[PDB]
RNA sequence: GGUAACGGAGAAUAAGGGUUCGACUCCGGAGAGGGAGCCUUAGAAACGGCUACCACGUCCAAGGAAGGCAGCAGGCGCGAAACUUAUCCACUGUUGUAUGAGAUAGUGACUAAAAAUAUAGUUGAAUACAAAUGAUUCUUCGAGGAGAGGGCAAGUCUGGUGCCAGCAGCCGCGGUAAUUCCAGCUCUCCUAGUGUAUCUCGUUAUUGCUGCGGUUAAAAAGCUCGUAGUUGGAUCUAGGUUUACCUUGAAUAAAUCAGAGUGCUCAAUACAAGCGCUUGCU
RNA sequence: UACCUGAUUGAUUCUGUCAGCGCGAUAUGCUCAAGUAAAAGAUUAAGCCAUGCAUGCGAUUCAUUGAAAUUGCGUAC
């Protein structure tokens, strides 16, 4: 059982702090290497340069080739793989393009049947991918 | 230099976005009292919630507590003047009994059509918008304006509005010219 | 199977259809009034 | 056009009288300050140029409207205890044309670079 | 040692107990590219003061002479990320002509309140202002974003495609009869807003003091001795010297939060105002 | 308002997390009748800065009211 004495405040506080580190959320939010490990460095979006277009085989039981793109981030030069959402939108993305990349939705974890991809494309050539898909705007 | 400007929110979103019971109940409130959107009804829900919470917090205290006395009479006073509480029902145990309909009734929009100045509640609203009503010699253009008890019997057409004596509207003037 | 070269296949194949026209639906309070009077909603089958 | 004066106070240490003026102009536009001035002068049996209305804001839908007025004992006290812009507005004084702030500042800075009597010449 | 650390007043969330944050208008501290040294002074280790070195610039007729926007406005870089090289001392203040302090207008879907699309624009006046602008009084003419299997409100309608293209936060849809993709039509939610990404709080009794769990789901040290720490039996006036603790006061900046009053036309706000009759009272 | 719902199984009850759901901050997509208040180069680069401004006003008046200059005061707010 936990201590219950009237003069055990130090033990209770110190034990709580010691055991908070065994918590994934607390450790993930206070470890100290978060900025150097996260590709975005704690940001929500990041600009990058497209290096190549790749296809990722969907996980089972699904079958498809998800059209992803390899990007190098400008702010730190780290390489990531980002998903190009919507149908036939890989055509809009040319090699050596400036793309805005955002998280995929699950805070650094893969989403759906796409394995190992944690980012998606929001803008290409300073144009919204959704706008291009909907026909609102055209390629600069 | 310039200090922080004070702002407050008057609406709280429902915890569950989609429940048929709540959706139907709120759509009926929009129906009877002609309102514009769900924010209009959430505003009244929020004010009623504040009133009820204050009453409950006071009632936690005994009867003759100084704070209980002062705040309780103040709250009952305000409700009476708005016309939402019963002037015989002077107690917080009974202020913890009101509904959103009580407040929604005291809106200017409802009274405009209730007193016959307009046919439908939508008519009431578009009149209030087009500046055809006045209150105690004041042209009010806010359909949400609450009508105090004193103001209840001093609401008639604007002294200028073509339906209250004034230059004919655009349609009439076009026809005349 | 998928090849990375068939991107935008179905949207290209899709037959093109045009839209229609309708009177500007009532907006704001009027739409809510129409809703209240009208009151599954889309029971095609 | 019913002009009414309330909260009238006598300020001898400034030789005037301060009052809140309210005008009722149902249907009519906002009362011009000259018209208000004449009515207040008649009200206080005083010259129509020893009364200073100002700060007249108009309530909605016509009718009511409020402002302030200063009744002055005489024109010398008036154009002694008064900002220049008020007098210019009412014609008691005349505006003095002045160069803009930017150009005055630049001229001052340029003069700072010159010593002796050539400062007045430099421009 | 680390801090992606200026402290506080406070902010977000919020049964209660809390968790997180706080560069930022008020208070205190520190700095003026990095250090160091000093003149003047009541007050400075001042930088819109000087002196040197370091780094980096500017003008030279090559002998020399200079610079410090983390002030306002602008420019370049950096980035996901942030405004006009505009008008004035009329306002609050500085000892009061001077005040990029301060006040105005510009850009401004940060944001907060109130509201039009059914039953706005536009003309000349006044007003306002330091001049304006804009509102306020008069007068001329005169609807979009997500969705539609479940969670979760809403189609087993039609056409294309056949594990492809794609959708899908999660569970899952698609293999030639797809309510889930691409479209048309219809509906649903909210609505001048509505979605996406990262993060904080709730949800979460999944950090548990209130208040978790340890036979088998993660978790009792192989066992014992033992210092610090924590915790320690009953017992002194019932009847007929110290502490700890509790009660009540004192000392305890505003702004913010709660809250009293007060028709800014309501509200968010603001701190006002309300009465006679004029020389006014509260 | 002291609240939960979907997902491990042929089905069941648990542990448990993931996901949903409400608010707020920042960025951003699409879109925006008129108005009223109003934040706004903090985050990274206390990085670098073209150009304008941001600190000046009793005694001494042989200039033409008061210039110039010497004083004094302020520029430590």
Swiss-Prot record, chain A:
The organism sits in which domain of life?
Eukaryota
Using the record's annotations, give every residue carrying the modification Hydroxyproline.
Answer: 61
| Gene Ontology molecular functions | structural constituent of ribosome
One Pfam entry name: Ribosom_S12_S23
Instruction: Please give the chief subcellular localization of this protein.
Output: cytoplasm
Location relative to the cell: Cytoplasm, Cytosol; Cytoplasm; Rough endoplasmic reticulum
Note the coiled coil stretches, chain numbering.
none
Looking at the UniProt record for this protein, which Gene Ontology cellular component terms does it annotate, in alphabetical order? cytosolic small ribosomal subunit; ribosome; rough endoplasmic reticulum
GO biological process, any: cytoplasmic translation
InterPro entries recorded: NA-bd_OB-fold, Ribosomal_uS12, Ribosomal_uS12_euk/arc
Which controlled-vocabulary keywords does the entry list? Cytoplasm, Endoplasmic reticulum, Hydroxylation, Ribonucleoprotein, Ribosomal protein
By sequence similarity, the record places it as follows:
Belongs to the universal ribosomal protein uS12 family.
Q: Which NCBIfam families match?
A: PRK04211.1 (NF003254), uS12_E_A (TIGR00982)
- Which PANTHER family does the record cross-reference, listed alphabetically? 30S RIBOSOMAL PROTEIN S12 FAMILY MEMBER
Subunit and partners: Component of the 40S small ribosomal subunit.
Q: What is this protein called?
A: Small ribosomal subunit protein uS12
Query: Which gene is the coding source of this polypeptide chain?
Result: rps-23
From Swiss-Prot, chain B:
- Which SMART domains does the record associate with it? Ribosomal_S4
| Broad class of where this protein is predominantly found | cytoplasm
Region entry Disordered, spans: 160-177
What SUPFAM superfamilies would the database entry show?
Alpha-L RNA-binding motif
Q: Which GO terms describe its molecular function?
A: rRNA binding; structural constituent of ribosome
Q: Name one GO biological process term.
A: ribosomal small subunit biogenesis
Please give the PROSITE patterns that the UniProt record associates with this protein.
RIBOSOMAL_S4 (PS00632), S4 (PS50889)
Q: By its UniProt entry, which InterPro entries does this protein fall under?
A: Ribosomal_uS4 (IPR022801), Ribosomal_uS4_CS (IPR018079), Ribosomal_uS4_euk/arc (IPR005710), Ribosomal_uS4_N (IPR001912), S4_RNA-bd (IPR002942), S4_RNA-bd_sf (IPR036986)
Is the Ribosomal protein keyword given for this protein?
yes
**Pfam families per the UniProt record, alphabetical:** Ribosomal_S4, S4
Alphabetically list the UniProt keywords: Cytoplasm, Nucleus, Ribonucleoprotein, Ribosomal protein, RNA-binding, rRNA-binding
Q: Which GO terms describe its cellular component?
A: cytosolic small ribosomal subunit; nucleolus; small-subunit processome
Task: Give all residue intervals belonging to the S4 RNA-binding domain.
Answer: 106-177
Localization: Cytoplasm; Nucleus, Nucleolus
Record-linked NCBIfam families: PRK04051.1 (NF003139), uS4_arch (TIGR01018)
Instruction: Sum up the protein's function in the record's words.
Output: Component of the small ribosomal subunit. The ribosome is a large ribonucleoprotein complex responsible for the synthesis of proteins in the cell. Part of the small subunit (SSU) processome, first precursor of the small eukaryotic ribosomal subunit. During the assembly of the SSU processome in the nucleolus, many ribosome biogenesis factors, an RNA chaperone and ribosomal proteins associate with the nascent pre-rRNA and work in concert to generate RNA folding, modifications, rearrangements and cleavage as well as targeted degradation of pre-ribosomal RNA by the RNA exosome.
* Subunit field text: Component of the small ribosomal subunit. Part of the small subunit (SSU) processome, composed of more than 70 proteins and the RNA chaperone small nucleolar RNA (snoRNA) U3.
The text of the family note is: Belongs to the universal ribosomal protein uS4 family.
Q: What is this protein called?
A: Small ribosomal subunit protein uS4
């Amino acid at each position: 059982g936990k201590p219950k004495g009237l003069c055990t405040a130090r033990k209770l506080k110190t034990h709580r702090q010691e055991q908070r580190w065994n918590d994934k959320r607390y450790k993930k939010a206070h470890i100290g290497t978060r900025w150097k490990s996260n590709p975005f460095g704690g940001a929500s979006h990041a600009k990058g340069i497209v290096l190549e277009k790749i296809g990722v085989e969907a996980k089972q039981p699904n079958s498809a080739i998800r059209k992803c793109v390899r990007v190098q981030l400008i702010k730190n030069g780290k390489k990531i793989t980002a998903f190009v959402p919507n149908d036939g939108c890989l055509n809009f993305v040319e090699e050596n393009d400036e793309v805005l990349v955002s998280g995929f939705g699950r805070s650094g974890h893969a989403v759906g049947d796409i394995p190992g991809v944690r980012f998606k494309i929001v803008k290409v050539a300073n144009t919204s991918l959704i706008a291009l898909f909907k026909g609102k705007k055209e390629r600069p | 230099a310039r200090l922080k400007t004070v702002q407050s929110k008057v609406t709280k979103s429902p915890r569950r976005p989609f429940e048929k019971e709540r959706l139907d109940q709120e759509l009926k409130l929009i129906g009877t009292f002609g309102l514009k959107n769900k924010r209009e009804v959430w505003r009244v829900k929020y004010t009623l919630a504040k009133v009820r919470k204050a009453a409950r917090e006071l009632l936690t205290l005994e009867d003759k507590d100084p704070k209980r006395l002062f705040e309780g009479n103040a709250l009952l006073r305000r409700l009476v003047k708005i016309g939402v509480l019963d002037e015989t029902k002077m107690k917080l145990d009974y202020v913890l009994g009101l509904k959103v309909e009580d407040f929604l009734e005291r809106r200017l929009q409802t009274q405009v059509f209730k007193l016959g100045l307009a046919k439908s509640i939508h008519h009431a609203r578009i009149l209030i918008k087009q500046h055809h009503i006045r209150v105690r010699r004041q042209v009010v253009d806010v359909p949400s304006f609450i009508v105090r008890l004193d103001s209840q019997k001093h609401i008639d057409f604007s002294l200028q509005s073509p339906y209250g004596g004034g230059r004919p509207g655009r349609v009439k003037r076009r026809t005349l010219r | 199977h998928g090849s990375l070269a068939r991107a935008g296949k179905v949207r290209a194949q899709t037959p093109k259809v045009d839209k229609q026209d309708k009177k500007k639906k009532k907006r704001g309070r009027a739409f809510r009034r129409v809703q209240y009077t009208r009151r599954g909603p889309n029971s095609n089958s | 056009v019913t002009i009414r004066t309330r909260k009238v106070l006598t300020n001898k240490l400034l030789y005037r009288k301060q009052m809140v003026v309210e005008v009722i102009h149902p249907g009519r536009p906002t009362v011009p300050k000259a018209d208000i001035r004449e009515k207040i002068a008649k009200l206080y049996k005083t010259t129509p140029d020893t009364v200073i209305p100002f700060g007249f804001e108009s309530k909605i839908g016509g009718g009511k409207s409020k402002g302030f007025a200063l009744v002055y004992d005489t024109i010398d006290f008036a154009k002694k205890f008064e900002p220049k812009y008020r007098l210019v507005r009412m014609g008691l004084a005349t505006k003095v044309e002045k160069p803009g702030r930017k150009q005055r500042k630049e001229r001052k800075n340029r003069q700072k670079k010159v010593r002796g009597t050539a400062k007045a010449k430099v421009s």
